[PDB]
UniProtKB/Swiss-Prot annotation:
Name of one Pfam family that matches: Fer4
Residues engaged in binding [4Fe-4S] cluster: C20, C39, C42, C45
Domain 4Fe-4S ferredoxin-type: start-end pairs: 1-28, 30-59
Organism encoding this protein: Hydrogenibacillus schlegelii
Name used for this protein in its record: Ferredoxin 7Fe
GO function terms (MF aspect): 3 iron, 4 sulfur cluster binding; 4 iron, 4 sulfur cluster binding; electron transfer activity; metal ion binding
Listed InterPro entries: 4Fe4S_Fe-S-bd, 4Fe4S_Fe_S_CS, 7Fe_ferredoxin, RnfB_subfamily
Residues bound to [3Fe-4S] cluster: C8, C16, C49
Amino acid sequence: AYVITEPCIGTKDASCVEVCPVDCIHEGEDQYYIDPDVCIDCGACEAVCPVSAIYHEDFVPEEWKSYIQKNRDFFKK
Ligand code: SF4
Ligand code: F3S
């Protein structure tokens, strides 16, 4: 699944939320998040996101797997 990290923080809007075939981009405190368990590993968002700030959950550094687990948290519990 393609999940948030860090470079998106407070950086612009749009060009991700509108593209997703399963609408699973939702809001966080500052930046948006993505439910990774819903995300069907389609990419797309990948291509439009500047420098792919949306990174695949295991390309995502262990440090930022915290955020993946956060995006999960948000929509699980
Ligand atoms: S990879 Fe596709 S399914 Fe997943 S969040 Fe991005 S646009 Fe949505
Ligand atoms: S920068 Fe953030 S606004 Fe979307 S296009 Fe990337 S997740």
